[PDB]
PDB file of N, CA and C in Angstrom:
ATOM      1  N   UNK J   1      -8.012   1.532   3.168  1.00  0.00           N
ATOM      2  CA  UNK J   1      -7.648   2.355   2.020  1.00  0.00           C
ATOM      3  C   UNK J   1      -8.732   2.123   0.990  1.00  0.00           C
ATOM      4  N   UNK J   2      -9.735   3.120   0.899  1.00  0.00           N
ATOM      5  CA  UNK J   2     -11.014   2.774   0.380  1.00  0.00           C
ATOM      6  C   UNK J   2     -11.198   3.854  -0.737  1.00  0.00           C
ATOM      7  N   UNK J   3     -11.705   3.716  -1.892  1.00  0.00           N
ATOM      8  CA  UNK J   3     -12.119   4.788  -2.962  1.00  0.00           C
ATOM      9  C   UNK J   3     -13.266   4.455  -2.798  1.00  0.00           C
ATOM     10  N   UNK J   4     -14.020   5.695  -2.038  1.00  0.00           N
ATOM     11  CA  UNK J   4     -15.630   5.509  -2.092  1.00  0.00           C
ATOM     12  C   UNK J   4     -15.874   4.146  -0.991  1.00  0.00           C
ATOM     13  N   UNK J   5     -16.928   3.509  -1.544  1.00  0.00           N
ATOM     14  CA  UNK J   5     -16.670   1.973  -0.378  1.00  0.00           C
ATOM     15  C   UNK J   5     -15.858   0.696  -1.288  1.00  0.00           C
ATOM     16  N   UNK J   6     -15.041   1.032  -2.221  1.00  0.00           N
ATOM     17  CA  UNK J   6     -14.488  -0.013  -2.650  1.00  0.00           C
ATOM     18  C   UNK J   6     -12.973  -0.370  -2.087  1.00  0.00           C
ATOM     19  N   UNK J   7     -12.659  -1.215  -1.468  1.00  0.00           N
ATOM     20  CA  UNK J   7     -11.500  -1.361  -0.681  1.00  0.00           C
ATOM     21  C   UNK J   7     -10.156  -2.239  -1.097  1.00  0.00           C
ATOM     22  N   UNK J   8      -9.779  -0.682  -2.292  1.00  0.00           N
ATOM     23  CA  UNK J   8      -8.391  -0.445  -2.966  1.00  0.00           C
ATOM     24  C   UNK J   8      -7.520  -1.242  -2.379  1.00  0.00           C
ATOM     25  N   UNK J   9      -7.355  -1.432  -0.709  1.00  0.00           N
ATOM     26  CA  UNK J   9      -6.064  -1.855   0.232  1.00  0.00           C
ATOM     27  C   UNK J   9      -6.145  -3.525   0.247  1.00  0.00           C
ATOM     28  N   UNK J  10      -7.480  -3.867   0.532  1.00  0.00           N
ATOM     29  CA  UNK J  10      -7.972  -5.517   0.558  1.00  0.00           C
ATOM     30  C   UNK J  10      -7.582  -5.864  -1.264  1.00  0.00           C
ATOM     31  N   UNK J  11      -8.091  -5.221  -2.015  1.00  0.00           N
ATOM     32  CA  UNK J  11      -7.845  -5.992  -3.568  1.00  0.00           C
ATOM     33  C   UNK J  11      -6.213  -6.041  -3.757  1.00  0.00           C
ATOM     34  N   UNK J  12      -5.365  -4.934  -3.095  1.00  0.00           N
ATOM     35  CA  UNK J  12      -4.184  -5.010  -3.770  1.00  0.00           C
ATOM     36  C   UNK J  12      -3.467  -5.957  -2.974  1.00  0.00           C
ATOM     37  N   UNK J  13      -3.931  -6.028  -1.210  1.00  0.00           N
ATOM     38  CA  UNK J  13      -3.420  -7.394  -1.212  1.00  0.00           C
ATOM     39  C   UNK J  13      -3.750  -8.735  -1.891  1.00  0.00           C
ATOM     40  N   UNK J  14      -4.811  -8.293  -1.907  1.00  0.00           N
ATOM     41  CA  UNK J  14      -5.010 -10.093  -3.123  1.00  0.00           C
ATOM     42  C   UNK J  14      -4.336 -10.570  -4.535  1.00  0.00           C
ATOM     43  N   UNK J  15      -3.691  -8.881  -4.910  1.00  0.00           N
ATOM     44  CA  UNK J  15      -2.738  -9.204  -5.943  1.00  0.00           C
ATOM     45  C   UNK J  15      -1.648  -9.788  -5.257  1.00  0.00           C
ATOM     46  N   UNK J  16      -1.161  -9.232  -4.349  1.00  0.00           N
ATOM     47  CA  UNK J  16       0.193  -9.152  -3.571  1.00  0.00           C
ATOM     48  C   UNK J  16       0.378 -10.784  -3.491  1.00  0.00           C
ATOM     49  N   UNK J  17      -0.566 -11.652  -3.409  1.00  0.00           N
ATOM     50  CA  UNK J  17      -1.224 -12.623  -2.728  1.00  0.00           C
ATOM     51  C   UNK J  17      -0.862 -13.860  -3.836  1.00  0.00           C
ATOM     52  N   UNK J  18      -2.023 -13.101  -4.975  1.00  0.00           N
ATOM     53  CA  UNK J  18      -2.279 -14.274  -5.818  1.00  0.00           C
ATOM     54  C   UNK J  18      -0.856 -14.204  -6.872  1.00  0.00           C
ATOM     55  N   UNK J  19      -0.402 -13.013  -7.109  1.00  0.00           N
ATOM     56  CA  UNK J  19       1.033 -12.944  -7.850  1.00  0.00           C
ATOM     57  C   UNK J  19       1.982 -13.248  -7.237  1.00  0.00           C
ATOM     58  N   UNK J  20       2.214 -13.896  -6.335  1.00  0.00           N
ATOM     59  CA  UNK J  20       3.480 -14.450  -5.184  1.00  0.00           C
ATOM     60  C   UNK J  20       3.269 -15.669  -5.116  1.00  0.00           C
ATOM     61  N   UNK J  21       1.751 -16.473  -4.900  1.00  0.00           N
ATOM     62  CA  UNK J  21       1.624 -17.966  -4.658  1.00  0.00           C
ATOM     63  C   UNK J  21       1.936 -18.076  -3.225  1.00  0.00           C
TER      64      UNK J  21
ATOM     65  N   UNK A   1       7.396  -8.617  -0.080  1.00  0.00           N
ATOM     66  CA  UNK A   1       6.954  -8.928  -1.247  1.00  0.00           C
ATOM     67  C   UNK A   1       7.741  -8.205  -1.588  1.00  0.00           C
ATOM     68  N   UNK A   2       9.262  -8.705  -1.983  1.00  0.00           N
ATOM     69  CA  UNK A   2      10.195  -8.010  -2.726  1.00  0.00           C
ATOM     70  C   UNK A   2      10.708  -8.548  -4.036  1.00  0.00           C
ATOM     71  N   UNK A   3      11.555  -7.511  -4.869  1.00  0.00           N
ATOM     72  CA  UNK A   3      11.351  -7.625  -6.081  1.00  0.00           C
ATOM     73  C   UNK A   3      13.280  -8.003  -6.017  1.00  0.00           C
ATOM     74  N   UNK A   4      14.123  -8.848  -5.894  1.00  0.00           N
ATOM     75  CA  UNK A   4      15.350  -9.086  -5.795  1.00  0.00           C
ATOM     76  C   UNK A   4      15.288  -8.692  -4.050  1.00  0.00           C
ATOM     77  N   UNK A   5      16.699  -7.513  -3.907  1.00  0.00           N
ATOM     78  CA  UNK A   5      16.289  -7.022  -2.771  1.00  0.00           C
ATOM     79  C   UNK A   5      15.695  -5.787  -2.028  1.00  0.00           C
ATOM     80  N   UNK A   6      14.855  -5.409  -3.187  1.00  0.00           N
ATOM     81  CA  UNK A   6      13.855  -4.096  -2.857  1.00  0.00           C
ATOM     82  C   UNK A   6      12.842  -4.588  -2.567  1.00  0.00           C
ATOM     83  N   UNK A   7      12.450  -4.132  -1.395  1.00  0.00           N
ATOM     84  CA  UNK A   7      11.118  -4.392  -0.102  1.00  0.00           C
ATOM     85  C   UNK A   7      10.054  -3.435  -1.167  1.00  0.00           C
ATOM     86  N   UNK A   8       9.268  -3.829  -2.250  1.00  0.00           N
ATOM     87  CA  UNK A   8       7.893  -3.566  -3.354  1.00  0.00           C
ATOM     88  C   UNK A   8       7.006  -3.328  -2.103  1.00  0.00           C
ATOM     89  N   UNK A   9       6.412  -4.204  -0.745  1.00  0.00           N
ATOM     90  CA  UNK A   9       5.445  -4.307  -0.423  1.00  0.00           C
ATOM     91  C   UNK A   9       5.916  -3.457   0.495  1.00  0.00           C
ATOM     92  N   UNK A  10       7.143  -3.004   1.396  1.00  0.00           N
ATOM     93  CA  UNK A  10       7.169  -2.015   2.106  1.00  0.00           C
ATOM     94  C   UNK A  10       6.630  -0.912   1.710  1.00  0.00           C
ATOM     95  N   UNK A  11       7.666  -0.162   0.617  1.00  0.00           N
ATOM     96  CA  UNK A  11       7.511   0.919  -0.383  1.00  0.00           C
ATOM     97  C   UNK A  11       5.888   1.271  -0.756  1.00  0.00           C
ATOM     98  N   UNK A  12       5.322  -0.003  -0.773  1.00  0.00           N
ATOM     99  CA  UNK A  12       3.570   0.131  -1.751  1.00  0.00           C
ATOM    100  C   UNK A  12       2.976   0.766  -0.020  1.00  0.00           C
ATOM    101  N   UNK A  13       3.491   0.367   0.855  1.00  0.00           N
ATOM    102  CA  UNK A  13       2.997   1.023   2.251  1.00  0.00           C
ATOM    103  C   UNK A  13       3.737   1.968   2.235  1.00  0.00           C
ATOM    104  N   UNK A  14       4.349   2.936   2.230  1.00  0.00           N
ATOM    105  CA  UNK A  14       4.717   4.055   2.436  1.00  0.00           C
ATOM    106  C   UNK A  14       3.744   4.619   1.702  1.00  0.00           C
ATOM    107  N   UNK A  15       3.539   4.445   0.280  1.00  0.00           N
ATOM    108  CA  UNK A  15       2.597   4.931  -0.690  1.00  0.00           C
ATOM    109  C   UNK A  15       1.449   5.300   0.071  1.00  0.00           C
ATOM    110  N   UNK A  16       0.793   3.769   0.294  1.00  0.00           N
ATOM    111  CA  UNK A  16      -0.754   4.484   1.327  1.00  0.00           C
ATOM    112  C   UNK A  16      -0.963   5.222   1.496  1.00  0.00           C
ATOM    113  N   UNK A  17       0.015   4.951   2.396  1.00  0.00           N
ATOM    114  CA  UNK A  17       0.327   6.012   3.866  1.00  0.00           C
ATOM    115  C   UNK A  17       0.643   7.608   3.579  1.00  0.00           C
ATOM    116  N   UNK A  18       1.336   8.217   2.412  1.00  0.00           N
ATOM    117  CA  UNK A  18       1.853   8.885   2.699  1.00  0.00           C
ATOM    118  C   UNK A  18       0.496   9.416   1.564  1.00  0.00           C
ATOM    119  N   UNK A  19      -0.698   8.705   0.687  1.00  0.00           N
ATOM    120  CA  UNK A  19      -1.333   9.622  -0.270  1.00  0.00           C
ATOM    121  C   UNK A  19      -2.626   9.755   0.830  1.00  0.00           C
ATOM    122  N   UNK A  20      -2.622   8.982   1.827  1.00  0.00           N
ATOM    123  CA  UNK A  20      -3.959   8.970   2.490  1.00  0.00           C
ATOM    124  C   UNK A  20      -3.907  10.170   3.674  1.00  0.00           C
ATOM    125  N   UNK A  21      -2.451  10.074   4.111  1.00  0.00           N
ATOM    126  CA  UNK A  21      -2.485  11.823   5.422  1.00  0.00           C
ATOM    127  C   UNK A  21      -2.680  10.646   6.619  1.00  0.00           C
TER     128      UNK A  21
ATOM    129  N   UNK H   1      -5.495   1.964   8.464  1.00  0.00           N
ATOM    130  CA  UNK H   1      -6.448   1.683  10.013  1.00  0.00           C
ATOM    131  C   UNK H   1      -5.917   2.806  11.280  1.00  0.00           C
ATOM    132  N   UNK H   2      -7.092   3.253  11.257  1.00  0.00           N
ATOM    133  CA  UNK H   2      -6.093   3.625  12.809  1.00  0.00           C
ATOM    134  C   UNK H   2      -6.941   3.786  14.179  1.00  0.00           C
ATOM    135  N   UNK H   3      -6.340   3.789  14.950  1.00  0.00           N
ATOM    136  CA  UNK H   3      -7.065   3.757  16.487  1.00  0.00           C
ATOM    137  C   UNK H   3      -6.642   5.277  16.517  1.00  0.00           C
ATOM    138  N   UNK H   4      -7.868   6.026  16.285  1.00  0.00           N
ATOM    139  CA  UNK H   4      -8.002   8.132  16.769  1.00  0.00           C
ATOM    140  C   UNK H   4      -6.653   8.290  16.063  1.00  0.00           C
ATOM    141  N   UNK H   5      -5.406   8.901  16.507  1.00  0.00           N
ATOM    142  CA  UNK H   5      -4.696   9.694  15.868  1.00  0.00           C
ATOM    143  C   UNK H   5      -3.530   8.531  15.544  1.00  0.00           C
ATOM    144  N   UNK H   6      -3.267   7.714  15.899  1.00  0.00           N
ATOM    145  CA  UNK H   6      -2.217   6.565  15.545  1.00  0.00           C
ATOM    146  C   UNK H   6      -2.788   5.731  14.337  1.00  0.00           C
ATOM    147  N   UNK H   7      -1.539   5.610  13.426  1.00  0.00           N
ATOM    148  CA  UNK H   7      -1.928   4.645  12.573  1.00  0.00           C
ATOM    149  C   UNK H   7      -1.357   3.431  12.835  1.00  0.00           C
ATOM    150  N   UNK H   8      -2.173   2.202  13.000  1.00  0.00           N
ATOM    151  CA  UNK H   8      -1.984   1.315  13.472  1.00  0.00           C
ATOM    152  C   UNK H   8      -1.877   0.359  12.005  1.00  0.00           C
ATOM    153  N   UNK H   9      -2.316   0.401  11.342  1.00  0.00           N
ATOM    154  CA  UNK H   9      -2.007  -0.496  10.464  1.00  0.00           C
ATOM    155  C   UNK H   9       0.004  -0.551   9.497  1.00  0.00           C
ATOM    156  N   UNK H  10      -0.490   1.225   9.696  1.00  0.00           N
ATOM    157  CA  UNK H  10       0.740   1.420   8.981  1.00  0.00           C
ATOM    158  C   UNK H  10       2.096   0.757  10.669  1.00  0.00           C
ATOM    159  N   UNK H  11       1.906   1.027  11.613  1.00  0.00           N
ATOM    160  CA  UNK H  11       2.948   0.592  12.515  1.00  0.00           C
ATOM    161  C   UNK H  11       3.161  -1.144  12.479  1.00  0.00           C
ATOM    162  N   UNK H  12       2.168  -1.892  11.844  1.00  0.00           N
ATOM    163  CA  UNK H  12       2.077  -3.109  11.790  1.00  0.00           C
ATOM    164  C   UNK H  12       2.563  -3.635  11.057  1.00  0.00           C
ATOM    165  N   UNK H  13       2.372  -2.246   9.712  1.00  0.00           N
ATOM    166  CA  UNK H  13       3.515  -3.124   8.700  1.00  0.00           C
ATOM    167  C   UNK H  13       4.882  -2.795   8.613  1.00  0.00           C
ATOM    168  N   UNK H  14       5.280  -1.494   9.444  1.00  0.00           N
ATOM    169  CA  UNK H  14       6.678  -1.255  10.180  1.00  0.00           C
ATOM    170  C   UNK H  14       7.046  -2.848  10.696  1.00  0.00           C
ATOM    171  N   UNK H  15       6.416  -2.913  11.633  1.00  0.00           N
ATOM    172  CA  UNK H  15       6.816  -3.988  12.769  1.00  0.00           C
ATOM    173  C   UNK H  15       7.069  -5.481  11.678  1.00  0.00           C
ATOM    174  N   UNK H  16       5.971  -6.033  10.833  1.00  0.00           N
ATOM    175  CA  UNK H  16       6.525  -7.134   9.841  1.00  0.00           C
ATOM    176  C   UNK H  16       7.783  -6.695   9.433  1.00  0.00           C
ATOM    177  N   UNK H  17       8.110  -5.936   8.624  1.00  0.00           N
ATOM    178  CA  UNK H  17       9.301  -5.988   7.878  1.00  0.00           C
ATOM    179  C   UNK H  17      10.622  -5.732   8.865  1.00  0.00           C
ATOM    180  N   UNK H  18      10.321  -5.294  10.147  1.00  0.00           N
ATOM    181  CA  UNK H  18      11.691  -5.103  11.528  1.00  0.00           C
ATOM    182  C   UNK H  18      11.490  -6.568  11.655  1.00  0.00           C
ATOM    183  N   UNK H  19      10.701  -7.287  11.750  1.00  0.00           N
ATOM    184  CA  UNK H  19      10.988  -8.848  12.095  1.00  0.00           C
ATOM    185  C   UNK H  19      11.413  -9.971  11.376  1.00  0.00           C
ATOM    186  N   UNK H  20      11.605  -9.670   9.921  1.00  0.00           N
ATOM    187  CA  UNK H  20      11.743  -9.714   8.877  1.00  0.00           C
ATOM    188  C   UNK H  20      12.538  -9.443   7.833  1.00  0.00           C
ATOM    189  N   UNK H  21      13.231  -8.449   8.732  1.00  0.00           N
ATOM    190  CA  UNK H  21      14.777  -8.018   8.219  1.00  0.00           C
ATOM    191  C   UNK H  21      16.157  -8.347   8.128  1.00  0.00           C
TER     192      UNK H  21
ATOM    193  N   UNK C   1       4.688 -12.501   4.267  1.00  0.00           N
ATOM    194  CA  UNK C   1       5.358 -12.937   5.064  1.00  0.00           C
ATOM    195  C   UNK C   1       4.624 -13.972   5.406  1.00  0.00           C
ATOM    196  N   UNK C   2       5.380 -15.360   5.643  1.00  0.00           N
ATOM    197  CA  UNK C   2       4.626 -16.379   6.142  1.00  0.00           C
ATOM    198  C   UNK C   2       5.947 -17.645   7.448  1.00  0.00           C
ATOM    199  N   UNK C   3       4.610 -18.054   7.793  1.00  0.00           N
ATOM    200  CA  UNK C   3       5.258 -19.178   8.908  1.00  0.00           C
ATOM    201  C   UNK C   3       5.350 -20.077   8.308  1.00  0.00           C
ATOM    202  N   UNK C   4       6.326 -21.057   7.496  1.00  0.00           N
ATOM    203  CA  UNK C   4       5.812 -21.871   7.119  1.00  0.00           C
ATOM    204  C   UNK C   4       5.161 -21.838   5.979  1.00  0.00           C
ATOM    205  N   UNK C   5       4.410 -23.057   6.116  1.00  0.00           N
ATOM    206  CA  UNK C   5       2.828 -23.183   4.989  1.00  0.00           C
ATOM    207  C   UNK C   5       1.825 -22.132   5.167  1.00  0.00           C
ATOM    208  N   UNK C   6       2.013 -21.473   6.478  1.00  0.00           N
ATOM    209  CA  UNK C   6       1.123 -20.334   6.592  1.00  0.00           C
ATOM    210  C   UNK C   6       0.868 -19.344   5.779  1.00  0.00           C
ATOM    211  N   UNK C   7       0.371 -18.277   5.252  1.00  0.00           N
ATOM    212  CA  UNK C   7       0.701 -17.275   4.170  1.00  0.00           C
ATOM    213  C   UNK C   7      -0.103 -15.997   5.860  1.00  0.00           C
ATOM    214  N   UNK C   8       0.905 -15.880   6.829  1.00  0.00           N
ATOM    215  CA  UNK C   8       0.856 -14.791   7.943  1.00  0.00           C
ATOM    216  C   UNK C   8       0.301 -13.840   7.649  1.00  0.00           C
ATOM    217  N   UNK C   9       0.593 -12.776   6.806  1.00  0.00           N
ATOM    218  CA  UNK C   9       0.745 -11.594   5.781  1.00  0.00           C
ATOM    219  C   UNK C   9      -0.259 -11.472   5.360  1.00  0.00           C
ATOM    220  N   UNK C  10      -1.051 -12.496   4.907  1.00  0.00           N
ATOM    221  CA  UNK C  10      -2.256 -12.282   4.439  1.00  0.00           C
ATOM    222  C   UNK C  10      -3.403 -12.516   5.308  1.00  0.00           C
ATOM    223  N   UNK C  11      -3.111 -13.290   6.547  1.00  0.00           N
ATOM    224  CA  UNK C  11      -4.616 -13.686   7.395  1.00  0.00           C
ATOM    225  C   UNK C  11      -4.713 -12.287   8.175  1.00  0.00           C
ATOM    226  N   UNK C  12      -3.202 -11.360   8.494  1.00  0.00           N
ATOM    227  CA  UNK C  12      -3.694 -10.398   8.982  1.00  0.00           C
ATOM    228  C   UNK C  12      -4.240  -9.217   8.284  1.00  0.00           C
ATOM    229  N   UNK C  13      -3.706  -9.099   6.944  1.00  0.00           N
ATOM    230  CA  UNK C  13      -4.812  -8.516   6.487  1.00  0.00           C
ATOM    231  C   UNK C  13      -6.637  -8.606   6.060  1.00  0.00           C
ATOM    232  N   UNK C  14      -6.430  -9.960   6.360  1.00  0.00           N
ATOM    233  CA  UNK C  14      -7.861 -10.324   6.027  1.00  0.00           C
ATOM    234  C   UNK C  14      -8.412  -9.785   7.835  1.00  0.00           C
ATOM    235  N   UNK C  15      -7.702 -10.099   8.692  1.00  0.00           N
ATOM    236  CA  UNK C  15      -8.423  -9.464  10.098  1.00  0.00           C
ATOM    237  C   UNK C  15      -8.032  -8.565  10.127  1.00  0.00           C
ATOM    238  N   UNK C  16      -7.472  -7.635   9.700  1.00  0.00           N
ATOM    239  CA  UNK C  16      -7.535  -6.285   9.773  1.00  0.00           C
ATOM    240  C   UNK C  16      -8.931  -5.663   8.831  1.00  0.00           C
ATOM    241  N   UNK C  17      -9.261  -6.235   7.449  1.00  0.00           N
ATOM    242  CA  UNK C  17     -10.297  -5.851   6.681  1.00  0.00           C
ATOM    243  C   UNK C  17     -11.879  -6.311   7.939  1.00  0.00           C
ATOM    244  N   UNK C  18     -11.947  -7.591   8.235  1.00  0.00           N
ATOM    245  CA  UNK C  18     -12.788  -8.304   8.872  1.00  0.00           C
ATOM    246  C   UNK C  18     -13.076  -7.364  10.012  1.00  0.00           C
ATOM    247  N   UNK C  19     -12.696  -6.829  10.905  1.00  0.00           N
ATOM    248  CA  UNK C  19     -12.606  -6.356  12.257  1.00  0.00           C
ATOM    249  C   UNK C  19     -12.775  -4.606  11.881  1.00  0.00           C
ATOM    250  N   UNK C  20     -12.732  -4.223  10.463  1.00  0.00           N
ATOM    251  CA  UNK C  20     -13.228  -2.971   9.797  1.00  0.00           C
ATOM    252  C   UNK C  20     -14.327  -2.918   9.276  1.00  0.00           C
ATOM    253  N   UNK C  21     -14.250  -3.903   9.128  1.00  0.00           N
ATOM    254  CA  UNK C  21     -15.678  -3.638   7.906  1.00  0.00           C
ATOM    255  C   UNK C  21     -17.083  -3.360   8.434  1.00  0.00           C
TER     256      UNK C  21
END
């Protein structure tokens, strides 16, 4: 899930990620 | 990654899914 | 993600949350 | 979703990004 080559899907898991612990 | 007992991280995948085709 | 016409990522995150339920 | 101490959920998205990129 990419805008352009920036990969929207990888960053929002890292929210998913870092806001859960 | 749910918010009580609403599945957030299911739902955020339907999203994807359903803006990407 | 998908392999040609299947979306495989999205069936993957079907399959977490059926195991998970 | 995780096993444990594992954080599951997230190594497969990191091999799902890894095995795309």
């Amino acid at each position: 899930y990419r805008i352009x080559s920036y990969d929207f899907x990888d960053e929002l898991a890292k929210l998913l990620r870092m806001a859960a612990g």
